[PDB]
């Protein structure tokens, strides 16, 4: 769909806002294992901390 037109019927919101970041999650086993392993690290053994 058009990038705007998302919020209610009006893009004006997005006009007021300076920096709009659309975030995307696509599944890439390399990257997905990266993020996952990172979280496993996050919980404990606190190795990340």
């Amino acid at each position: 769909k058009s990038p705007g037109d998302n919020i209610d019927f009006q893009t004006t919101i997005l006009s007021r806002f300076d920096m709009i970041f659309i975030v995307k999650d696509d599944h890439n086993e390399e990257r997905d294992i990266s993020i996952a392993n990172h979280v496993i690290n996050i919980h404990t053994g606190n190795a990340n901390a």
Partner: peptide, 14 residues
């Protein structure tokens, strides 16, 4: 800054 905001424009495009 120009290029950072350019990434924002790329976000405006999609």
């Amino acid at each position: 800054a120009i290029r950072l905001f350019q990434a924002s424009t790329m976000d405006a495009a999609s």
